[PDB]
Every structure is written in structure tokens, then in C-alpha cells.
Design a protein that fits this description.
This protein is an all-alpha fold and about 475 residues long. Helix content is about 80%, strand content about 0%. Bound molecules: (2S)-2,3-dihydroxypropyl (9Z)-octadec-9-enoate (6 copies), (2R)-2,3-dihydroxypropyl (9Z)-octadec-9-enoate (OLC) (12 copies), calcium ion (3 copies), chloride ion (CL) (5 copies), sodium ion (2 copies) and zinc ion.
Length: about 475
């Protein structure tokens, strides 16, 4: 368990480091066409990391690597590296000659000056793909040797190098964090290079067709399942300049309470279902109560305090009062979906825990199609706020489908949690007088205390049994 607590500390600071990276973007670049161009240029390697984070490489590499032995293991590894090196080299050369293909994938609607700059930055980011693939392969090898802690922290390397590049941007401009992104991908790979170079190199691609047969179907499935990322960005690119940047500032901050409250708090309770499948309904209700307990007060507090929170973190240097006003509205639009995505995540993973992949797949399809259609309608009409809202409404639709499916929900506890959250709201509203820029921190503490006090009143009998 000591490694589990250590990994939580490591994850917290890794999340905070990403937040600090964005804080510096706001200070050194604010919201601008030039940061739009940066995000366009990094989005393909970023997107590819996300897909490999869902297991796209390990899903095929692990079984085919582990089944082999002796120098057939080296020959398999060489086949994978050689085959991908060939494909990637071809596509980086094509990227140099036709950068508009990648640009128009993520920023088709962006202005002329944006696309020109993104072309220049893509010359630097496109090679990072090669080092991301190698990183993903080494990551898989480490996983087959039961190494999980340290490989999971290597993305922090890239955030440090981007941060350093952002500091140097006062001399070079936006190209400095772009170079930092490339160097980050190189050093991420070098941090775990030994797992690859301990193998003998073979001039062979013998096993590459075998590996592709198992890799590509799953890889494409994971591409499609993460596509809403691409659609969000491409739709907003048609709005005002800086729209891409607004969406990144708001969504990257929102992912902090999302990851904590909509997913992580309910994991332990959800873990029990696999071992105790015949009590599925009880355990699912238990997990849903936990999710609601955290997401409902968090949603209320975040929305009420969205402007002072954004101001505290982002409103420095080039990030203006106007930027705070807009980013805060986008954050509210996302935060309205927090409890719905919490419920969604809880029911979906509970289904997986009992080997039902069909119902989670249908729900995910509904959410994805809903999100695309609503992006078209609301995103083209209202820019980033419309895209954020579309994402939240899509989650509501997914929740309605899943609730009709499991036909269970802890209604009594939802009402108790909601009342405690509204009592909390009433109190924080009363403490809203000073307008000091740091007062929102005290209101968060007051809100937590009020919420837990009244939680203990309404759950007194339950606390006694636990205590
Ligand atoms: C070579 C294709 C590059 C595609 C375009 C990106 C440009 C990259 C530039 C330089 C790459 C140098 C890094 C080379 C990294 C080492 C390659 C490797 O993994 O070898 C493993 C074997 O020894 C064991 O199987
Ligand atoms: C995933 C979105 C796919 C966008 C493809 C594209 O390049 O479109 C160009 C413009 O016509 C509209 O984006
Ligand atoms: C050096 C190893 C990284 C290879 C990739 C380096 C890309 C540099 C570049 O494209 O500059 C364009 C102006
Ligand atoms: C699938 C992605 C489609 C992207 C939306 C779009 O193409 O907008 C085009 C603009 O001209 C509409 O205002
Ligand atoms: C300190 C005050 C803590 C009050 C805790 C009150 C329990 C909240 C709850 O609804 O829990 C649902 C289940 O997941 C519990 O197993
Ligand atoms: C503000 C709150 C936002 C979060 C609201 C999310 C979901 C509301 C759910 C509405 C209630 C939906 C209940 C549907 C159901 O199947 O109930 C079955 C039970 O009677 C048997 O156990
Ligand atoms: C903001 C509070 C951040 C402090 C809490 C950080 C929690 C770190 C974590 O990720 O814990 C995962 C675990 O499964 C459940 O929290
Ligand atoms: C340490 C533990 C991790 C905590 C999270 C810190 C993470 C990122 C920096 C966010 C804070 C950066 C802004 C603080 C400075 C500030 O806001 O100063 C007020 C401003 O000068 C008047 O407008
Ligand atoms: C700063 C974060 C430093 C992160 C350092 C990661 C190094 C690592 O993960 O090494 C794993 C592998 O087992 C050894 O090569
Ligand atoms: C260890 C290096 C860590 C980060 C380097 C960040 C790279 C910052 C790039 C600064 C040099 C630069 O950007 O030069 C542009 C010309 O044009
Ligand atoms: C280490 C490789 C660092 C790669 C740094 C690339 C610098 C660069 O490409 O500068 C372009 C000008 O324009
Ligand atoms: C750059 C990577 C190029 C490596 C090509 C290796 C290769 O194609 O070997 C073919 C061999 O004849 C049968 O596997
Ligand atoms: C600008 C740099 C961009 C670099 C982007 C690198 C992405 C490469 C990913 C996969 C290999 C693609 C080649 C796939 C070849 C076809 C695979 C195949 O044959 O799959 C058969 C399957 O059974 C039928 O469903
Ligand atoms: C589910 C969607 C909404 C539930 C109700 C959400 C209630 C949250 C209200 C929070 C609030 O009152 O925010 C006021 C702030 O001034 C505005 O920016
Ligand atoms: C708006 C209409 C939305 C369309 C709703 C129907 C789409 C899914 C159909 C059948 C699922 C069977 C395939 C399940 C694949 C799971 C594979 C897996 O997860 O492994
Ligand atoms: C691409 C264009 C439309 C995709 C519409 C959505 C297609 C359905 C997405 C599949 C999905 O969500 O899968 C979840 C996990 C297992 O793939
Ligand atoms: C609102 C969209 C969801 C409407 C309910 C869809 C439905 O009928 O779901 C029944 C399914 O058989 C359950 O697995
Ligand atoms: C996330 C929860 C943990 C965070 C813990 C942070 C600890 C508190 C830090 C700073 C408080 C600063 C509060 C400053 C309040 C302003 C006081 C003031 O000067 O108010 C003037 C006005 O006239 C009144 O009437
Ligand atoms: Ca600006
Ligand atoms: Ca060997
Ligand atoms: Ca300020
Ligand atoms: Cl601008
Ligand atoms: Cl072996
Ligand atoms: Cl970034
Ligand atoms: Cl194979
Ligand atoms: Cl084989
Ligand atoms: Na500017
Ligand atoms: Na426009
Ligand atoms: Zn093979």
C-alpha cells in the first residue's frame, strides 16, 4: 500500500505541474492566434499520447511480445520498431510538404496568420510522433516486466521542458515552448530507453504484418472513441481567434475536478463489484452515492466561484480581464456536466466490472454522436461556450440511457446531498462581501466545513455504525 500512497502523491504533483504549465501559458501568451497555432501544432502528438494512454500500443504489443522468447523476442521488437519507423518517416516527410493536412484537421477555420504559424511549428512537433511511438513501445516492455510507477510519471518530463521553453519565450516567442514540446518527447523516451536498447537489433520486419493485424483494429477503435477531442477543436477554430486557446484553458482546468470527483473517488467502491458480482445492485448504488457526494457540492462551489478561481490561476501577464470573463463562462458550461459524467463513469465501469461491454459501448456511442451533433449546432453558433455546453448535454443524454439500463439510482441520498449542497451554497453566498482576490479560498474552506457539518447531521446514524 506504500507504493499506492506514493503514486497518489506523485499523481497529485504531476497534475499540479500541468496546471502550472498552463498558468505560464496564460502569463506569457494569454489568449492569442499564436497560442491557437501552438495547440494546432501539438494536437496530433498530444492526441496520439492520449490513444496510447488508453492502451492502444500495449493491447497488441504485450501479448505478442510476452508469448515469444530468446532472440525471437528481439526480432519481434525490431520488426515493430522498423515498421513504425518506416511509416512515421513517410508521414513526417509528407507533413513537411503538406502541413495543411494536419492543420485543417484541428484548425480548419483558423485565420491565415494562424495557419502560417502552425505550419512553421509543425516542422518541430511532427518529429515528436516518432519519439512518442518509441516511448509507448518502451512503456509496454516495462509493463511486461511489472514496472508501472516510474513509467507513469515520465510525462512530467515534457511539462518541465515546455515550462522552460515558456520562460524563454520572452526572447524567441511561441517557438520556444514548441521546441520544449519536442525536446520533452525526446527526453521522455530517453528516460526509459534501456527497455528497448537492451535488445539486439535485427534488420527485419518479419513480424510487423502480424503485429499490425492485432494493433490497427484496436488503434482505430481508440482513435474513434477519442474523436470528440478533434471535433471540439475543429468546430471552435471557426469562431473568433483565440477560441482554441479559450477551450484549452477552460478544459485543462476542468479536468482537475473531473478526474478527482467524477472518476477517482468512486474507484475503490467500483473495484468490489468484480469480486462480488451477485450483489451488483447494492455495490452500484454504493458507488453512485459516493460519486454524488463529491460531484454535486463541487459543481455548486465551482460554478459559484468560477470567476475568482480563474482569476487566481490564469489572470497574470498577457491573460486579461476579458480572458477571465470568457474562460469562467466556459468552465461553468463544463462544470454543469460534472455530476452527469460522474454518474456516467460510475455506471459504465460497473458494467465493465461484470463483463458487459455492450451497454457501455452503446452509451459511449450515444454520448459521442450527441457531442458531435451538438458541437455543430451550439459550437458553430456560440464558439467555445457552445462546445463546452454540448459536451455537458451529451453527458446528460448518456446518463439518461444508462439510467434506463440499470434501472436503479439512490434517490434518497441524491436529495440529501443536494440539500446539503444548497445549504452550503446559501452560506458561501452570505460570506461573499469583501471582493478580495484571495477570499474565495476561505469560502472554499467554509463551504467544505458547512457541507461536512450538515452531511454529519443527515448521516449521523451512518457515521455511528462506521465509527
Ligand atoms: C528514423 C525515422 C525518423 C522519423 C522522423 C523523425 C526524426 C527522428 C530523428 C532522429 C531519430 C534518432 C533517434 C533514434 C532512436 C533509437 C532507435 C531505436 O529505438 O533502436 C532500437 C534498437 O537498437 C533495438 O531494437
Ligand atoms: C475531425 C474533423 C475533420 C475535419 C476534416 C477537414 O479538414 O475539414 C476541412 C473543413 O472543410 C472543415 O473542417
Ligand atoms: C535533432 C533531433 C530531433 C529531430 C527533429 C528536429 C526538427 C527541427 C526542425 O524541423 O526545424 C525546422 C525549422
Ligand atoms: C466534422 C467537422 C465539421 C467542422 C465544422 C465545419 O465544417 O464548419 C464549416 C463552417 O464553414 C461553418 O460555419
Ligand atoms: C466526515 C463526514 C463524512 C460524512 C459521510 C456521509 C456519507 C455520505 C454518503 O452518502 O456515502 C455513501 C456511501 O458511499 C458510503 O459508503
Ligand atoms: C443537479 C443534479 C445533477 C445530477 C442529476 C443526475 C441524475 C438525476 C437522476 C434522476 C432520477 C432518475 C431515476 C431513474 C431510475 O431508474 O430510478 C430507479 C429507482 O427508482 C430504483 O432504484
Ligand atoms: C484538491 C485536493 C487534492 C488532494 C487529493 C489528491 C488525491 C490524489 C489521488 O489521485 O487519489 C486517488 C484515489 O484513488 C482517490 O483519491
Ligand atoms: C504549492 C502546492 C500546489 C498549489 C497549486 C499551485 C499550482 C500552480 C500555480 C497556481 C498559483 C499561481 C498564481 C499565484 C500568484 C497570484 O495569484 O498572485 C496574485 C496576483 O499577483 C494578483 O492578481
Ligand atoms: C521529474 C520527473 C522525473 C521522472 C523520471 C522518470 C524516469 C523513469 O520513469 O524511469 C523508469 C525506468 O524504469 C528506468 O529507465
Ligand atoms: C534541457 C533543455 C530543456 C528545455 C529546453 C527548452 C527549449 C527552449 C528553446 C529555446 C531556443 C529557441 O527557441 O530558439 C528559437 C530560434 O528560432
Ligand atoms: C535536441 C533537438 C532540438 C531540436 C531544436 C530545433 C531547433 C529549430 O528547429 O529551430 C528552427 C528555427 O526556425
Ligand atoms: C528504417 C527502418 C528500415 C528497416 C527495414 C528492415 C527490413 O525491411 O528488412 C527486410 C528483411 O529483408 C526481411 O525482414
Ligand atoms: C505526421 C506523422 C503521422 C504518423 C502517424 C502514424 C500512425 C500509424 C498508426 C498505425 C499504422 C498505420 C498503417 C496501417 C496499415 C494497415 C494495417 C492493417 O493492415 O490492418 C489490417 C486489419 O486486419 C484490417 O482491419
Ligand atoms: C444540473 C445543472 C444544474 C443544477 C443546478 C446547479 C446550481 C448551481 C448554482 C451555482 C450558482 O448559483 O452560481 C451563481 C454564480 O453567480 C453564477 O456564475
Ligand atoms: C443513435 C443510435 C446509436 C447507435 C446505438 C447502437 C450502436 C451499437 C450497436 C450494437 C452494439 C454491439 C457491438 C458492441 C461492441 C463492443 C465491443 C467491445 O467493447 O469489446
Ligand atoms: C468518426 C465519426 C463518427 C463517430 C461516431 C461515434 C462512433 C461510436 C464511438 C465508439 C465508442 O464510443 O466506443 C467506446 C469504447 C470502445 O470503442
Ligand atoms: C434519452 C435517451 C435514452 C432513451 C432510452 C433508450 C432505451 O430505450 O433504452 C432501453 C435499453 O433497452 C436499455 O438497455
Ligand atoms: C483550497 C483550500 C485550502 C487553501 C488554504 C488557503 C489558506 C488561506 C490563504 C489566504 C487567505 C487570504 C484571505 C484574504 C481575505 C481578505 C481580507 C481583507 O483584507 O478584507 C478586506 C475587506 O475590507 C474586508 O471587509
Ligand atoms: Ca489576447
Ligand atoms: Ca535478446
Ligand atoms: Ca492578476
Ligand atoms: Cl490574437
Ligand atoms: Cl526470453
Ligand atoms: Cl501543452
Ligand atoms: Cl508477431
Ligand atoms: Cl509470429
Ligand atoms: Na498577445
Ligand atoms: Na471566423
Ligand atoms: Zn509474428
Amino acid at each position: 500500500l506504500f507504493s499506492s500512497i506514493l503514486f497518489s502523491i506523485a499523481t497529485f504533483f504531476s497534475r499540479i505541474l500541468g496546471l502550472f504549465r498552463d498558468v505560464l501559458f496564460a502569463k506569457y501568451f494569454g489568449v492569442s492566434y499564436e497560442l491557437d497555432a501552438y495547440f494546432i501544432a501539438i494536437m496530433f502528438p498530444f492526441f496520439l499520447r492520449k490513444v496510447f494512454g488508453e492502451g492502444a500500443m500495449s493491447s497488441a504489443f504485450v501479448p505478442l511480445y510476452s508469448e515469444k522468447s530468446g532472440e525471437e523476442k528481439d526480432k519481434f521488437l525490431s520488426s515493430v520498431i522498423n515498421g513504425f519507423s518506416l511509416i512515421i518517416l513517410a508521414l513526417v516527410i509528407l507533413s513537411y510538404f503538406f502541413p495543411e493536412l494536419i492543420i485543417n484537421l484541428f484548425g480548419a477555420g483558423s485565420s491565415h496568420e494562424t495557419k502560417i504559424l502552425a505550419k512553421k511549428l509543425l516542422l518541430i512537433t511532427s518529429p515528436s510522433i516518432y519519439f512518442i511511438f518509441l516511448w509507448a513501445i518502451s512503456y509496454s516492455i516495462l509493463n511486461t516486466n511489472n514496472k508501472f510507477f516510474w513509467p507513469a510519471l515520465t510525462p512530467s518530463i515534457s511539462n518541465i521542458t515546455i515550462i522552460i521553453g515558456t520562460f524563454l519565450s520572452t526572447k524567441y516567442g511561441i517557438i520556444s515552448p514548441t521546441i520544449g514540446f519536442l525536446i520533452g518527447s525526446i527526453l521522455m523516451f530517453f528516460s526509459i530507453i534501456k527497455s528497448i536498447i537492451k535488445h539486439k537489433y535485427y534488420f527485419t520486419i518479419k513480424h510487423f504484418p502480424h503485429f499490425l493485424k492485432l494493433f490497427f483494429p484496436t488503434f482505430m477503435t481508440m482513435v474513434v472513441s477519442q474523436i470528440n477531442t478533434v471535433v471540439d477543436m475543429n468546430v471552435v477554430s471557426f469562431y473568433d481567434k483565440g477560441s482554441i486557446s479559450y477551450l484549452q484553458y477552460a478544459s485543462r482546468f476542468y479536468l482537475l475536478p473531473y478526474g478527482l470527483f467524477a472518476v477517482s473517488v468512486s474507484t475503490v467502491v467500483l473495484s468490489k463489484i468484480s469480486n462480488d458480482r451477485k450483489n451488483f445492485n447494492y455495490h452500484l448504488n454504493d458507488a453512485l452515492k459516493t460519486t454524488l457526494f463529491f460531484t454535486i457540492p463541487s459543481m455548486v462551489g465551482l460554478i459559484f466561484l468560477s470567476t475568482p478561481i480563474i482569476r487566481f490561476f490564469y489572470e497574470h501577464g498577457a491573460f486579461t480581464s476579458k480572458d477571465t470573463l470568457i474562460t469562467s463562462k466556459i468552465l461553468i458550461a463544463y462544470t454543469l456536466g460534472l455530476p452527469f459524467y460522474g454518474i456516467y463513469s460510475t455506471i459504465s465501469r460497473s458494467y465493465h466490472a461484470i463483463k458487459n461491454t455492450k451497454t457501455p459501448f452503446i452509451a459511449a456511442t450515444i454520448v459521442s454522436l450527441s457531442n458531435i451533433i451538438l458541437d455543430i449546432i451550439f459550437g458553430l453558433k456560440y464558439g467555445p461556450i457552445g462546445v463546452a455546453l454540448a459536451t455537458s448535454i451529451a453527458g446528460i443524454i448518456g446518463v439518461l440511457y444508462l439510467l434506463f439500463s440499470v434501472k436503479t439510482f439512490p434517490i434518497k441520498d441524491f436529495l440529501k446531498i443536494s440539500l446539503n449542497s444548497l445549504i452550503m451554497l446559501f452560506v458561501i453566498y452570505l460570506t461573499d462581501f469583501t471582493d478580495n482576490e484571495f477570499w474565495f479560498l476561505i469560502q472554499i474552506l467554509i463551504g467544505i466545513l458547512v457541507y461536512l457539518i450538515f452531511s454529519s447531521i443527515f448521516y449521523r446514524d451512518l457515521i455511528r455504525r462506521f465509527l
